[PDB]
Amino acid sequence: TSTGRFTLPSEENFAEKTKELAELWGADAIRNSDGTHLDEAVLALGKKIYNAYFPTRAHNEWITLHMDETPQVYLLTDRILAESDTVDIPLMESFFAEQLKPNRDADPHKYWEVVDRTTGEVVDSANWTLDADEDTVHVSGVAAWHEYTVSFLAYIIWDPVEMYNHLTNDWGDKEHEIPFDIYHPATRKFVFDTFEQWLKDSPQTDVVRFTTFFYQFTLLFDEKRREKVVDWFGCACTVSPRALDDFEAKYGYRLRPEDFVDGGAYNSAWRVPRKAQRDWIDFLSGFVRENVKQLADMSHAAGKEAMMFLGDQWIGTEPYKDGFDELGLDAVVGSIGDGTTTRMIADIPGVKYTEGRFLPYFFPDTFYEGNDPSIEGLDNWRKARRAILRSPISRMGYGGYLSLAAKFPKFVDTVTHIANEFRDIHDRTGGVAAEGELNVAILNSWGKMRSWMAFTVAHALPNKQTYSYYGILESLSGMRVNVRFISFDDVLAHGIDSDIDVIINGGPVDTAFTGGDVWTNPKLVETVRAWVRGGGAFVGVGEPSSAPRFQTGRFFQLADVIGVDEERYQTLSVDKYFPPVVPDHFITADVPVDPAAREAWEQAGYRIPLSGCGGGQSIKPLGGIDFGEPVLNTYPVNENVTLLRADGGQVQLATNDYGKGRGVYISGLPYSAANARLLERVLFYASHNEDKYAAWSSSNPECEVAHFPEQGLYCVINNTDQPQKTTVTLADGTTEDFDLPDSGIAWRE
Amino acid sequence: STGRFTLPSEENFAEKTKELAELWGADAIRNSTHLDEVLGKKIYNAYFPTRAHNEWITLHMDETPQVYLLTDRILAESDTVDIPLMESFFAEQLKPNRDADPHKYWEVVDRTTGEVVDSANWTLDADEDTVHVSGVAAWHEYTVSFLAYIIWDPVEMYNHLTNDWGDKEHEIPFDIYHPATRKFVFDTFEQWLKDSPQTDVVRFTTFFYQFTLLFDEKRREKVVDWFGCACTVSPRALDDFEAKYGYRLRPEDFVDGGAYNSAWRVPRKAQRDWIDFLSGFVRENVKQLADMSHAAGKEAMMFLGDQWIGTEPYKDGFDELGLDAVVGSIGDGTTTRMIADIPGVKYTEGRFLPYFFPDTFYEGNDPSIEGLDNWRKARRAILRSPISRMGYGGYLSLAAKFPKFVDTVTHIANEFRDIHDRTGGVAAEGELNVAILNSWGKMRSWMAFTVAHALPNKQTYSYYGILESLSGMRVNVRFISFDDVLAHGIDSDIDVIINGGPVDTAFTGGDVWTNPKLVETVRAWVRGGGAFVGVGEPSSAPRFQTGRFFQLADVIGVDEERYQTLSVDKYFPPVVPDHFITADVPVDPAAREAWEQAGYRIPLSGCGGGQSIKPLGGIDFGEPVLNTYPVNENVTLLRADGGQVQLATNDYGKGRGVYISGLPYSAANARLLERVLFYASHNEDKYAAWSSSNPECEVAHFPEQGLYCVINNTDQPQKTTVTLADGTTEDFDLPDSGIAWREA
Numbered sequence A: 001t002s003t004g005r006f007t008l009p010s011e012e013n014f015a016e017k018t019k020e021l022a023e024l025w026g027a028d029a030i031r032n033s034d035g036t037h038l039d040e041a042v043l044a045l046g047k048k049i050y051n052a053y054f055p056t057r058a059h060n061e062w063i064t065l066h067m068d069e070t071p072q073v074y075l076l077t078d079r080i081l082a083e084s085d086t087v088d089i090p091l092m093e094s095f096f097a098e099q100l101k102p103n104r105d106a107d108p109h110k111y112w113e114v115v116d117r118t119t120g121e122v123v124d125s126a127n128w129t130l131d132a133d134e135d136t137v138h139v140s141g142v143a144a145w146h147e148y149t150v151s152f153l154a155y156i157i158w159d160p161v162e163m164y165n166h167l168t169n170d171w172g173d174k175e176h177e178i179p180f181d182i183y184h185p186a187t188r189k190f191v192f193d194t195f196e197q198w199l200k201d202s203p204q205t206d207v208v209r210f211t212t213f214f215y216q217f218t219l220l221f222d223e224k225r226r227e228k229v230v231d232w233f234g235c236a237c238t239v240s241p242r243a244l245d246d247f248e249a250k251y252g253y254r255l256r257p258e259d260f261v262d263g264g265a266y267n268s269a270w271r272v273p274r275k276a277q278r279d280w281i282d283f284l285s286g287f288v289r290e291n292v293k294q295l296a297d298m299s300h301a302a303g304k305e306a307m308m309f310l311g312d313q314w315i316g317t318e319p320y321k322d323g324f325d326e327l328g329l330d331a332v333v334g335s336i337g338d339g340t341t342t343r344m345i346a347d348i349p350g351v352k353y354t355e356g357r358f359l360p361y362f363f364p365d366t367f368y369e370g371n372d373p374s375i376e377g378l379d380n381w382r383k384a385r386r387a388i389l390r391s392p393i394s395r396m397g398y399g400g401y402l403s404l405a406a407k408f409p410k411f412v413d414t415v416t417h418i419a420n421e422f423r424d425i426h427d428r429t430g431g432v433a434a435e436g437e438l439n440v441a442i443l444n445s446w447g448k449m450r451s452w453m454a455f456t457v458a459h460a461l462p463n464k465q466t467y468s469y470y471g472i473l474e475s476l477s478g479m480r481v482n483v484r485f486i487s488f489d490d491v492l493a494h495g496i497d498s499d500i501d502v503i504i505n506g507g508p509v510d511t512a513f514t515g516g517d518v519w520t521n522p523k524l525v526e527t528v529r530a531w532v533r534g535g536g537a538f539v540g541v542g543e544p545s546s547a548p549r550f551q552t553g554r555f556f557q558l559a560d561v562i563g564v565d566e567e568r569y570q571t572l573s574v575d576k577y578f579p580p581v582v583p584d585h586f587i588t589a590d591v592p593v594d595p596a597a598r599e600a601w602e603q604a605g606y607r608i609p610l611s612g613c614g615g616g617q618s619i620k621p622l623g624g625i626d627f628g629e630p631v632l633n634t635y636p637v638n639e640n641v642t643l644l645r646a647d648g649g650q651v652q653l654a655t656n657d658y659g660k661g662r663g664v665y666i667s668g669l670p671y672s673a674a675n676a677r678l679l680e681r682v683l684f685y686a687s688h689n690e691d692k693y694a695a696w697s698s699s700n701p702e703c704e705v706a707h708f709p710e711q712g713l714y715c716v717i718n719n720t721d722q723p724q725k726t727t728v729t730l731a732d733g734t735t736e737d738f739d740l741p742d743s744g745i746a747w748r749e
Numbered sequence B: 001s002t003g004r005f006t007l008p009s010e011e012n013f014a015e016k017t018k019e020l021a022e023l024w025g026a027d028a029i030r031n032s033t034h035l036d037e038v039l040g041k042k043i044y045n046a047y048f049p050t051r052a053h054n055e056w057i058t059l060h061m062d063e064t065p066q067v068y069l070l071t072d073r074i075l076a077e078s079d080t081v082d083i084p085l086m087e088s089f090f091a092e093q094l095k096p097n098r099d100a101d102p103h104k105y106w107e108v109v110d111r112t113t114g115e116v117v118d119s120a121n122w123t124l125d126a127d128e129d130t131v132h133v134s135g136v137a138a139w140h141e142y143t144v145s146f147l148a149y150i151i152w153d154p155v156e157m158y159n160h161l162t163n164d165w166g167d168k169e170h171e172i173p174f175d176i177y178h179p180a181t182r183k184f185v186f187d188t189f190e191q192w193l194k195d196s197p198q199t200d201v202v203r204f205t206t207f208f209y210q211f212t213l214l215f216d217e218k219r220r221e222k223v224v225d226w227f228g229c230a231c232t233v234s235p236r237a238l239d240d241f242e243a244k245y246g247y248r249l250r251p252e253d254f255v256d257g258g259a260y261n262s263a264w265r266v267p268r269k270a271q272r273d274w275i276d277f278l279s280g281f282v283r284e285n286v287k288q289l290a291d292m293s294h295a296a297g298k299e300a301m302m303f304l305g306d307q308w309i310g311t312e313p314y315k316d317g318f319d320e321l322g323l324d325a326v327v328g329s330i331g332d333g334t335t336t337r338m339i340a341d342i343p344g345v346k347y348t349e350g351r352f353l354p355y356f357f358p359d360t361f362y363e364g365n366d367p368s369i370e371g372l373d374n375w376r377k378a379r380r381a382i383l384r385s386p387i388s389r390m391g392y393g394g395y396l397s398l399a400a401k402f403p404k405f406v407d408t409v410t411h412i413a414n415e416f417r418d419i420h421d422r423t424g425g426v427a428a429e430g431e432l433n434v435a436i437l438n439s440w441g442k443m444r445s446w447m448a449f450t451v452a453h454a455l456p457n458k459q460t461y462s463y464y465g466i467l468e469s470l471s472g473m474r475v476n477v478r479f480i481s482f483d484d485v486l487a488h489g490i491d492s493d494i495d496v497i498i499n500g501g502p503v504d505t506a507f508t509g510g511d512v513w514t515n516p517k518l519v520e521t522v523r524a525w526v527r528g529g530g531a532f533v534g535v536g537e538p539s540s541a542p543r544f545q546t547g548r549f550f551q552l553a554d555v556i557g558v559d560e561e562r563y564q565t566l567s568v569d570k571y572f573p574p575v576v577p578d579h580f581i582t583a584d585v586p587v588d589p590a591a592r593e594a595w596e597q598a599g600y601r602i603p604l605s606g607c608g609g610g611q612s613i614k615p616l617g618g619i620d621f622g623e624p625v626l627n628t629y630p631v632n633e634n635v636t637l638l639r640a641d642g643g644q645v646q647l648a649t650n651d652y653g654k655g656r657g658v659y660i661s662g663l664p665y666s667a668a669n670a671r672l673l674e675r676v677l678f679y680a681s682h683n684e685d686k687y688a689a690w691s692s693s694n695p696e697c698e699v700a701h702f703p704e705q706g707l708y709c710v711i712n713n714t715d716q717p718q719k720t721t722v723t724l725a726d727g728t729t730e731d732f733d734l735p736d737s738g739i740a741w742r743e744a
């Protein structure tokens, strides 16, 4: 009975149950509760011992004596309306005073900017003063009826992880942990000296679990103690006067506070990055990386592993940028939130192994009397499992309080099953990826550096604005294709790699994800058009290839490829003619049929041509597919485009032949089993690979197949908590029928 | 009570004609062609200046009107590409002008780069309508813009295709810009006048230029703009334009990248220069026709439609033409107002619906229903801006076969005349001064948010609703332009400004909102007590500010998230369900309970909080404006369903801003708008006086006659209580389409 690949949390006064559960779950590693030297009875088990390290917090005794060395962020004030030629702007009224504090030490006139937001102009620094007695900037000689703001440097006085916990589990009047910035040599020396001593003081730790490193991700709170700004990939909170001044020297130009506050966007990953953002990323990453390497080296010299948590103070690491391997990190561990976040961890190059921390975390918010944590446990396993077959992770484990999980025998038995199943998958496949059946490339401004990081604001929390796009990643995360992320820069520099079958471009207009004005670069349009014409496949979602204003008559610059454009109220004089919808088609074959709606749709018919209204639009909606957020007034560019769904006087789903290749338009794609199948059929259809679809496929969309040619195996998995019957089709055209229980898996030669 | 009513007649109908003219109180008759010694009625005869003379135009086919046509986009797959000119167009309507040098008058464009392709890189095929382009970039799209002759008049062509006349000869239109054709038109008209002594009113239907109307190769409408002047060019006109204006127009100044100068486009200098050139010419020639009619003892009357381009009825100087009347088609409230509000003429006439034709006058149908419908929509508007005369078109013989309809017309004509008699034709008292602000201003009064006459659709109805609501509302409506506000500020008599429409249209205004002087003027005015009502995407300007889309977001308390600010949590304050603005919205108790029960979203990372989990509903806002959100928690949200904002109000100094995401016309929505206007202008105390409790009825106060009326806008009985100025109430129970008059 398999053992290993499993990390178990421990805690004091819990020797008996720890060994029972380690035995039961086949743990080869134990996570010592933070701080804490652990029970000898636990240490005698001879498991691999994880101890977490918190390098830039939990030492107020240092940082209270060097408060100008805390991390910093540019903050943007509320917009203040001048009603004459003077205006006063309070600095701190919209922000949380327990987290943030204006920096009055570094000359405001050098480091800050007052902006007239109505004109975009910087106000002369001779026209403003910072009040000596309170956090208010006085501006004079400006225009009445304009809005003004200040961008100012703020010390961060409360570490966001310690803060979030405090506020979330109200730890009352417990001391707030103050973060510290290693960019400053005094602090940096304190950090490495402390780490050296801790290494000496921890002979029994096998793995130093850095949780995490030097810089928080963008996270700001308001005066009502709510989250104000968040970007899980953002490096807002990484500046200081010295860092900014060194940057100017090295790069040959001075950043504006505007290059950080970004009009109030705070350099959201959704914004098309410019040179300033790419340069800062590069400057910050060189410095963070140099220092992570030192930590790894020191860990190794002491005989221990270096393991990074993919979260908390992870900024500047850039796990997907070239050179990550140079750090010599042994492992990355992250939170398993779904398939997309499973891949974000799994696909990381340059480490020896990866580790998933599965849900639920062992805490009272889920482990309370009358709750059934086992359901979520299995759910989480199933969403990660489908992804693990496409890109394996090396290890699994859980976090929190063992003594809490131990009170729920059903949950305990569920983990026993998950752990055995994790090891079975690994042992049968040798930890190798399943065969991908097509090569699919997501194209955006960021490319590989943001692999599995697209369409995200906060970690694993899709919302109204992101779910129609995030669903694309979640579908792909466990799909039987090979997925890579590429950038407009890669494409302009090197063309489109010849192994790629399908390119996906998706998002709203004017985001890093669709690409913005890069679509008015004729070389990009030529490259993609030539490639589609020669048998490439282009799948556009939402507002693909969009560029406002460039052409009065063409919003999606590749409207010709995908057969669809969005009306922008500039072309209303042009009657739009919709060809009849094709309801029977390869792409839609697995969509459940609703005869009541189809009948209502067929009875109601198509709008006859009418002046200023065009014609051809179905009077009633066919429906049957959840397309998410609408893209208003999409329409077919000519009548040779194939409309598959065009309900409510606009287009949701369309396909277009373009020379040898095809274009497909999808207006949006929330994740569901049915939509993942829809997407999957789109990939095969657009690449002219219909004849390749059946090999290693499951007839039922609720199940997936993974083929492992090198070990002579395939499996089939049930992605649901319900029994599923399905017919698997093998490469030679043979089939087998399955009856898969709840969350089950079957393996065959 | 008799008169103010125009009746049509065919031939061979003397007896019944006389009966109906006396039933309806007709004081004028519209003849098709001359008959019966029915001859002391005012006689209307239609005149068609620029068609029905094929004998002339076939001898001068280079003097037909012309238009710039934009071809399909053709993909180049190497350094050469061929572009057929006519494949997307109707060949019986349009023919390429091979007469005027293509290399001087046409343009080939690389649509991928926007660059004009050098004339030396293209040729026009000698034997087919195909342009050969060489020395170009592979994988770009290319188009030609070319001059086309218009060989079929669009009124004759619409009517032809509507009742397939088959081989009936096609009327070819002619352009009076050329001297020979102009001379033919005036001489012919001079002669026609001599021959028509019984004709009292020359009903010009219409003048010299068709509105933008182009058909495709499948015989369908391709491009339409009721206000557009696409079909008004010629090599001579363009050459002359350059002499007068000091620059050469590009064909692109007309085809407009495919938009063809839709009135929805923000007009640039070229569009305005052409309007002015064309208008000068057109008006000069219309004045002559009016002069000629006058020296023959006849009235000159203009049809607001068909060939009306260049007249510009709302532009200053229109009065100088000396036109006695405008007649127009009554489609709805908005189109009624469009006719009624025209200055510079002696009287106005509406042609009411239905037209007397078999498409509605057929066995089994009750056209009185439509008759009353049409009359109710116009009436509410006539109260606010009276029209002089009414009447119908079509075959009287067909309508006469429908005695309930005949009774309905009698009821209508009598009621029309009764309103005139009681009020002396004066406009009802307006209770607020309301200005619509856009790029066009008054030249396009009641013409906003329109493509095809009186045909709102999916893309327009959420904004056309604003006009349809105001058309019959008890307030004074003006239309002003950004140039007006920039040159003169905001008139001291205006209570409320409305800005409405999608981003980057003439109706919101586009980049004018990046002009700080505009922003200064509106903000200062609002702050001192003005009212700003923004509909859809008011004040929007893309890209100008990363964190601000609606430039006056601060005024109205609402902006639209454009995916630049997703990192910023949005906090929605609780909705206020009981409020002056929404007071007449019906409360559906199971809906309200479900909404109260689902509660509000608690704040979650990257998701903000405070949005309702279930919708309150109750109001149809039309097309969604995605991801609108409150700029702060001091804004009052009245409707914020589905994680976005439909209705909100914000105090801004002494004034207020209001946001409405869209407003399809209905009695409820009209009422909503009206309460928004009184609220935004801090005039809640003024709302009661001369109002109807029931949104299905409206009140017109005529203080100079010590008199008000209340009208039933529906075909159903409606109970309502009117409040008067003194705080007094009076009750009514009105029948279908009813009216009631009271001493005041």
Ligand SMILES: [Mg+2]
Pocket: B126, B127
């Ligand atoms: Mg030839």
